[PDB]
Amino acid sequence: ISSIQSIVPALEIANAHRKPLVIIAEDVDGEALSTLVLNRLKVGLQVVAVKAPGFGDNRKNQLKDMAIATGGAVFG
Amino acid sequence: GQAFRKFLPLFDRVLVERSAAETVTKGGIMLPEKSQGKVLQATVVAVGSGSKGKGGEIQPVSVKVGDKVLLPEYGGTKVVLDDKDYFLFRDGDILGKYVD
Amino acid sequence: GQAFRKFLPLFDRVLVERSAAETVTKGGIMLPEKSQGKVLQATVVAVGSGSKGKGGEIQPVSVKVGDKVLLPEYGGTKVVLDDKDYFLFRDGDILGKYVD
Amino acid sequence: GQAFRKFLPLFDRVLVERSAAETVTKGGIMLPEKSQGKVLQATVVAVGSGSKGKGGEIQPVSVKVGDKVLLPEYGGTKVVLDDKDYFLFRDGDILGKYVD
Amino acid sequence: GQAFRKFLPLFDRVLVERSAAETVTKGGIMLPEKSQGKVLQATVVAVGSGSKGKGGEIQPVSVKVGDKVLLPEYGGTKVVLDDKDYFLFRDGDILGKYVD
Amino acid sequence: GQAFRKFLPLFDRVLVERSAAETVTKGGIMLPEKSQGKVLQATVVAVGSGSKGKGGEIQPVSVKVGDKVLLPEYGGTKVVLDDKDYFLFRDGDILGKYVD
Amino acid sequence: GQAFRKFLPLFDRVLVERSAAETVTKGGIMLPEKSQGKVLQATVVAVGSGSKGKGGEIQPVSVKVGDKVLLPEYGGTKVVLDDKDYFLFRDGDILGKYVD
Amino acid sequence: GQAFRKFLPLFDRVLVERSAAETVTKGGIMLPEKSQGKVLQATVVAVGSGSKGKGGEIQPVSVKVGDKVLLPEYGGTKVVLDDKDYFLFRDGDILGKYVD
């Protein structure tokens, strides 16, 4: 997640529900990380980003396992 | 042509100012300053008399002062008037007009 | 010219929207999104007044609003109107129309 | 201009189909497919109204629908009309006709 | 325009055939085929109707069928008519003619 | 045209004296010389007769000797008159005028 | 146009031959062959009818056969007539004339 | 046109002689020869007849023989007349005139 448009609507859903957001991604760099830290420091948006554990197919398997365990869906 | 804060564009040049960049989205997510690109929406603050298209008459520009216009991506000239930023385009380089 | 969603193109520009990309073939084979390139079919949603080809009169745009046209590969300008995508071409860059 | 297969070229454009590539020589030797380059012989299926060469009148194209022409090597645009391939040229880019 | 072997060039195009490459010198020395470059001497076999240089009239080509002309080194187009090679030039690319 | 220090520009050329570079800010912080780029504000000191835009009359320039003008970034020609710097532009390169 | 040894240039072309290269200096110091560059002095041996500068008449060339002219360094075409070298230029590429 | 040393420029070409390079400053410091670049001050020694700007009449050049002119940095052609150096410019390439 590195672009503005790839991170804003998830943050909008999290901000419209008053509930914290945890991103588990391959990486969160670029402008998306700046948006995350700006919304965390200024207004106090509850959010945190974390890299995806695993290399290669193990990363895909572990992300799918986390999505099934939390009831979410793997993006991209 | 019409001058704006004691500046009159020459020939078929249009002086505009861009609309303010969006700081926050509709949800409420604060946007960062670096990621905000150049706003292609502008309002016309000054116009020139025009160029000569044919023989014996002046050809005026197609926008008026106060018109809301859509800027192109490349083709603006930096003008600093009273420590405020302004951009100079040609009349034919303006893509369109937000009529109301 | 004829405006569309409070936007009027200037000179000989033509604002169109592209036809939707094919999601499925005639049999039932679902197509992927990255494979689908830019659709060269479009419909004209806005036209401009025109340019000045000769002396004393202006030449109108040769397509009308609602015409089905075939876009070229390169030459479109991105216009976002009401968070929906639109493309701006010149009159001479339109290859042809589909008459019915 | 004359429209073909619910498609009308604009300005001075000309829609043609190339003749089929030679599969067998005069002796009887079967040719392969990757050998057969683009056939420069074509027949005109559609024409446009024309361009404005001078002031106050339209100038038609110099080929008719159903006329046999010689294409150049470069300058054609791909047009697909119900899965059959077609090529779009300018009027001035056509090398010559085959009068009969 | 004047047609040759049922081929009529369009606009200001001239179809010529080049003279034969010299095979033996005046002294009697046989020349190799690879050394013989393209012959810049040609005879005009077909002419187009011409272009429209000025308003309201057609401008014919400066050469007629049967003229002996001198070709430039570049600017010709290959045309194969009845398995024999011919070259297509513009009227203005012809350097000169050999009047007799 | 109007000459300056026994120098008369030709056709549509405008000779401008550039304004002195600012050496201190509004508070008292003195600026360095290498930091000071080329000043785009100028005064017109010399005016050429003009060019022939149409048939039978000369077209005068749109600036006057005394006008305060905004120079472009690139397009000036170096002129030294009485050991003093001057710059030569065309009429069309002048962006605008500071009318009072 | 005026033809030279049964060769007539077309439109605004001028056939000249260059003056012989200087073999020896004024004292007697003989020059070498590869030292002598292309001689820019020439005599006009053939002229063309001319081009069509305006409507309804042709513009003749500005040199006559037998005139002494100053060639530029690039812009000449080799013509071989009776095994001797000749050069073809445009009318406008000739720098000047040695009137006597 | 006006000839100089039996040389007449063609069309809108002006033959000028550059002013001698300065060899000593006003203080008395002798200057070196490699330092002195091409002098941009010149005197007009030969004048061409002119070009055809419009229809039906010749348009002369805007300088005359004896005029003191300011040369550009690039655009001169080398002419050697009676072993003395001379430079050929276009009329439109002359920056200005030192009227007295």
From Swiss-Prot, chain A:
Q: Where are the transmembrane segments?
A: none
Which residues does this entry mark as bearing N6-succinyllysine? K51
List cystine links: none
At the top level, the lineage of the source is Eukaryota
Sites where N6-acetyllysine occurs are at: K19, K42, K64
- Report the subcellular localization: Mitochondrion matrix
Tell me, in a sentence or two, what this protein's role is. Answer: Chaperonin implicated in mitochondrial protein import and macromolecular assembly. Together with Hsp10, facilitates the correct folding of imported proteins. May also prevent misfolding and promote the refolding and proper assembly of unfolded polypeptides generated under stress conditions in the mitochondrial matrix. The functional units of these chaperonins consist of heptameric rings of the large subunit Hsp60, which function as a back-to-back double ring.
What's the family? Belongs to the chaperonin (HSP60) family.
Q: What disease involvement is noted?
A: Spastic paraplegia 13, autosomal dominant: A form of spastic paraplegia, a neurodegenerative disorder characterized by a slow, gradual, progressive weakness and spasticity of the lower limbs. Rate of progression and the severity of symptoms are quite variable. Initial symptoms may include difficulty with balance, weakness and stiffness in the legs, muscle spasms, and dragging the toes when walking. In some forms of the disorder, bladder symptoms (such as incontinence) may appear, or the weakness and stiffness may spread to other parts of the body. Leukodystrophy, hypomyelinating, 4: A severe autosomal recessive hypomyelinating leukodystrophy. Clinically characterized by infantile-onset rotary nystagmus, progressive spastic paraplegia, neurologic regression, motor impairment, profound intellectual disability. Death usually occurs within the first two decades of life.
Q: What is its quaternary makeup?
A: Homoheptamer arranged in a ring structure. The functional units of these chaperonins consist of heptameric rings of the large subunit Hsp60, which function as a back-to-back double ring. Interacts with 2 heptameric Hsp10 rings to form the symmetrical football complex. Interacts with HRAS. Interacts with ATAD3A. Interacts with ETFBKMT and EEF1AKMT3. Interacts with MFHAS1. (Microbial infection) Interacts with hepatitis B virus/HBV protein X.
The protein, known as: 60 kDa heat shock protein, mitochondrial
Q: Which organism is it from?
A: Homo sapiens
Q: Which gene encodes it?
A: HSPD1
UniProtKB/Swiss-Prot annotation, chains B, C, D, E, F, G, H:
Q: What induces it?
A: By stress.
- Annotated localization: Mitochondrion matrix
Q: Which SMART domains match?
A: Cpn10
**Which keywords appear in this protein's UniProt record, sorted alphabetically?**
Acetylation, Chaperone, Mitochondrion, Phosphoprotein, Stress response
SUPFAM superfamilies, per database record: GroES-like
Q: N6-acetyllysine: which positions carry it?
A: K6, K38, K54, K64, K68, K78, K84, K97
Q: N6-malonyllysine (modified residue): where?
A: K38, K52, K54
| UniProt GO molecular function | ATP binding; metal ion binding; protein folding chaperone; protein-folding chaperone binding; RNA binding; unfolded protein binding
Tell me which residues bear N6-succinyllysine. Answer: K26, K38, K52, K54, K64, K68, K78, K84
Role played: Co-chaperonin implicated in mitochondrial protein import and macromolecular assembly. Together with Hsp60, facilitates the correct folding of imported proteins. May also prevent misfolding and promote the refolding and proper assembly of unfolded polypeptides generated under stress conditions in the mitochondrial matrix. The functional units of these chaperonins consist of heptameric rings of the large subunit Hsp60, which function as a back-to-back double ring.
Similarity field: Belongs to the GroES chaperonin family.
This chain's protein is named 10 kDa heat shock protein, mitochondrial
